[PDB]
């Protein structure tokens, strides 16, 4: 019964336009709770969840300042890597940073993450021990050496083991009604005649949270693992998620197929068939 | 809250 | 270096002809992050389409949710048109109410 606090940072240079754009989004589990975007006039760290309005002014001002300064460092980093690689300014380049903590039911750290990518590829990563770095090419070897020199691992490890865990506990408390809601999917099967002989049965899962779900189809108890089509789980836009899964079946045989739904918010799994009337 | 600093590459 | 966007076009609530609703365009698995997203009603660009902040996946590829208010009817057409460096031309994906 775990939870996670995660931040996603992106700097993207725009050749012809101005300075690189810097974007931050922060998540508790599947819920976006804060953001920052340097394309805003007078850009600030912003709440993306209503319950984050409980953090007072000092929180927002300190996070804004950190973000702004971090954006500046991402800009320096972009210039540094252009230099390592002798690349053109006519192309845009992208630097990404993801870090965070997973905590178990006991509130203790299960694992910490801290990793960067340049132009969509792994550049440097903090190893699971939170003490050593894995580099990729010899540009990232240089970066690794510099981080070893300023004992960067110690600073990131200390954050991930202490404040990351504590802030996760705080946000879980502040946002408990939203964050612990376990909204089960409301499910139904729809019917779409396909070719006079065949029909599509589509099983719907709507308004659920968290995103993790299983939505499966069976023919007389046999799992249709080779036949079933499904879409990626997708946000409704309101904090909940959606999914569907479908099978093509012989018209007049629809009764033999079942949709099966599992989710944290369902104490028992759902079994559904297409209801004609 | 965010990491106190980022890597200098 | 370059990954091709996947697109889903769908309503927030189950679609009912005449009732106000929200149309979503969920654009995922692309890189670089620069992308152009337009939502269309009967071939015309919809003004006031909000973009919900650009996050990313385990493979570093980007995802974003474009959304706008809409009111479906029996004959109106809605689409999402996406322009991205990985694609030669823009890809248009029409809203299907059963999807
Ligand atoms: Na959870
Ligand atoms: Na900017
Ligand atoms: Na970190
Ligand atoms: Na949660
Ligand atoms: Na960095
Ligand atoms: Na981001």
Author numbering:
A (entry chain A): 1 to 277
B (entry chain P): 1 to 9
C (entry chain B): 1 to 99
From the paper:
The Qa-1a/Qdm complex was crystallized in space group P21 2 21 with one complex per asymmetric unit, and diffraction data was collected to 2.04 Å resolution. The Qa-1a heavy chain forms three domains, α1, α2, and α3, with α1-α2 forming the antigen binding groove lined by the two anti-parallel α-helices α1 and α2, which sit above an anti-parallel β-sheet platform. The Qdm peptide AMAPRTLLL binds in an elongated fashion tightly to the binding groove, as indicated by very well-defined electron density over the entire length of the peptide. The peptide is bound via 14 H-bonds, 3 salt bridges, 3 water-mediated hydrogen bonds and 1 sodium-mediated hydrogen bond. The presence of a proline residue results in a ‘kink’ in the peptide, and together with the underlying Tyr99 residue of Qa-1a leads to a slight separation of the peptide binding groove into two halves. The N-terminal half is slightly smaller and mostly hydrophobic in nature, while the C-terminal half is slightly larger and contains a pronounced negative charge due to the presence of Glu116 protruding from the β-sheet platform. Surprisingly, however the N-terminus of the peptide, especially Ala1 and Met2 are bound mostly through hydrogen-bond interactions with backbone oxygens and amide, while the C-terminal part of the peptide that is accommodated in the negatively charged area of the peptide-binding groove is bound mostly through vdW interactions via Leu7 and Leu9. Here, hydrogen bond interactions are restricted to the backbone oxygen of Arg5 with Qa-1a residue Gln156, as well as the carboxyl terminus of Leu9 with Qa-1a groove-lining residues Tyr84, Ser143, and Lys146. While the Qdm peptide binding to both Qa-1a and Qa-1b appears almost identical, except for slight differences in the position of Leu7 and Leu8, two amino acid variations are located inside the peptide binding groove (His9 and Val24).
Of these MHC Ib molecules, murine Qa-1 consists of the 4 allotypes Qa-1a, -1b, -1c, and 1d, while humans encode the ortholog HLA-E. In addition to antigen recognition by T cells, Qa-1 or HLA-E are recognized by NK cells, most notably through the binding by the inhibitory heterodimeric receptor CD94/NKG2A. Qa-1 has been shown to present the nonamer leader peptide (AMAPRTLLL) found in most classical MHC Class I alleles of H-2D and H-2L. Loading of this leader peptide, called Qa-1 determinant modifier (Qdm) into Qa-1 is dependent on the transporter associated with antigen processing (TAP). Both Qa-1 and HLA-E monitor the steady-state expression of MHC Ia molecules and relay that information to the cell surface where they engage the inhibitory NK receptor CD94/NKG2A to prevent killing of a healthy antigen presenting cell. We report the crystal structure of the non-classical MHC–Ib allele Qa-1a in complex with the Qdm peptide.
